[PDB]
Amino acid sequence: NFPNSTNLPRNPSMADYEARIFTFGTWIYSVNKEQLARAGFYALGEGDKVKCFHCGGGLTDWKPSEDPWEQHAKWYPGCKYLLEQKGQEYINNIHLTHSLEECLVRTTE
């Protein structure tokens, strides 16, 4: 009705928060663990590597200042769990802002 896969997570064993935060036992990383977990991410245990349990997108090399939700959208706009969670205008927001930054830097050729 809204697809096969999209409808179905890439890793159901990580659909519940509780399941995800656990993976963050030893989080020696700047980014907050509760937040990542909330944004759908979990830790692979290969450093600061994380993967959204639904679209299966993976992020790494997090900066201290970064927001889980923003980079999830900055990189994986298509995730359905993201759309249910943060809505349409949010996703497009992040992307427009980037698109604007690009065009404003294009004046520099």
Partner: peptide, 4 residues
């Protein structure tokens, strides 16, 4: 962040 960076994707992988």
């Amino acid at each position: 962040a960076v994707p992988f």
